[PDB]
C-alpha cells in the first residue's frame, strides 16, 4: 500500500523556491547527488571497519550514472549505507529544517542556488531538472523502500517490489521536457569532470 505524507512546511517552501526562481546554472544538481552518494559510501565504509558483516549485502563501494532516453530518466546509483523508513518519513525532514532555514536566509546577503550543499539540503536541487524524483534505497537494518515526489507538497513511501538492490540508494530523475541534455553522454562527462572530478569511489557513466 502507498502511504502519502506532507513535507514539513519549510522543505515544501525550499522545494517551491528551487522550482520557481530563475536560475540557469541547473547542472549543479549532479554534484549534489554525487556528494550525497560519497557521504553514504564513506559511512558504510566507516561502519564495516568494526563490523565486516555490514558488507554481506555487497562489498563494492561505487557510483553508477545511468541515462535512459526511452524512459527520460537519469539514475544515480550508489552502494552506500542506504536509508531506513525512519530516514525517509521523519529523520531526513527533521535535519533538513535547519539547513533549509540557513540556506533560505543566505539567498539574501547575496548567496545563490549553487550553494545549497553547504547547508546539507543539496538533494532538493534534483528539482532544478526533474519533474518527479523517485528514490529506491535499502539499508542493512530494514527493507527496500520506494520514496517519491513530484513536489506539490507531498511525497509517498511504499515497500519496493522492483529488483532487489543489496544495499544502497538509487535516485531516479524523471527529467523535465527541456532538460534532456542530461541524458547525453558528453554533457554528463563534462559535468562530472568540472564539479565531481575528485570523488573517492569509481563513477561509471553507463552509455545507452
Ligand X SMILES: CCCCn1c(Cc2cc(OC)ccc2OC)nc2c(N)nc(F)nc21
Closer of 15 and 191 to ligand X (Cβ): 15
**Per-residue contact flags (x/-) with ligand X for residues 167 to 186, judged by CB under 6 A:** --x-----------------
Q: Residue 84 interacts with ligand X (CB under 6 A)? A: no
Tell whether residue 123 is among the known ligand binding residues: yes
Residues contacting residue 19 through CB under 8 Å, at least 6 positions apart: 127, 151
Residues contacting residue 9 through CB under 8 Å, at least 6 positions apart: none
Closer of 40 and 130 to ligand X (Cβ): 40
Q: Residue 123 interacts with ligand X (CB under 6 A)? A: yes
* The C-alpha cell that represents 165 in the structure block: 538492490
Instruction: Report whether 17 contacts 9 (CB < 8 A).
Output: no
Closer of 96 and 192 to ligand X (Cβ): 96
Q: Residue 100 interacts with ligand X (CB under 6 A)? A: no
Q: Residue 81 interacts with ligand X (CB under 6 A)? A: yes
Give the chain's end-to-end CA distance (angstroms, integer): 33
Instruction: Report whether 176 contacts 129 (CB < 8 A).
Output: yes
Q: Residue 80 interacts with ligand X (CB under 6 A)? A: yes
Positive or negative, the Cα torsion across 203, 204, 207, 208?
Answer: negative
Q: Residue 78 interacts with ligand X (CB under 6 A)? A: yes
- Tell me whether residue 187 is exposed, middle or buried, using C-beta atoms within 10 angstroms of its C-beta: 0 to 12, 13 to 18, 19 or more: middle
- Footprint of ligand X (CB under 6 A): 36-37, 40, 78, 80-83, 88, 92, 96, 120-121, 123, 135, 147, 169
Bind-site residues for ATP: 36, 78, 97, 123
Amino acid at each position: 500500500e502507498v502511504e502519502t505524507f506532507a513535507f514539513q512546511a519549510e522543505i515544501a517552501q525550499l522545494m517551491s523556491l528551487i522550482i520557481n526562481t530563475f536560475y540557469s546554472n541547473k547542472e549543479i544538481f549532479l554534484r549534489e547527488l554525487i556528494s550525497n552518494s560519497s557521504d553514504a559510501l564513506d559511512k558504510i565504509r566507516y561502519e564495516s571497519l568494526t563490523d565486516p558483516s555490514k558488507l554481506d549485502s555487497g562489498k563494492e563501494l561505487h557510483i553508477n550514472l545511468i541515462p535512459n532516453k526511452q524512459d527520460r530518466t537519469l539514475t544515480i546509483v550508489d552502494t552506500g549505507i542506504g536509508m531506513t523508513k525512519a530516514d525517509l518519513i521523519n529523520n531526513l525532514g527533521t535535519i533538513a529544517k535547519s539547513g533549509t532555514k540557513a540556506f533560505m536566509e543566505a539567498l539574501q546577503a547575496g548567496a545563490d542556488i549553487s550553494m545549497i550543499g553547504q547547508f546539507g539540503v543539496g538533494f532538493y536541487s534534483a528539482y532544478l531538472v526533474a519533474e518527479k524524483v523517485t528514490v529506491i534505497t535499502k539499508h542493512n537494518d530494514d527493507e527496500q523502500y520506494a520514496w517519491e515526489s513530484s513536489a506539490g507538497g507531498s511525497f509517498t513511501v511504499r515497500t519496493d517490489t522492483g529488483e532487489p538492490m543489496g544495499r544502497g540508494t538509487k535516485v531516479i530523475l524523471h527529467l523535465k521536457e527541456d532538460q534532456t541534455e542530461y541524458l547525453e553522454e558528453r554533457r554528463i562527462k563534462e559535468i562530472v569532470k568540472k564539479h565531481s572530478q575528485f570523488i573517492g569511489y569509481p563513477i561509471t557513466l553507463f552509455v545507452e
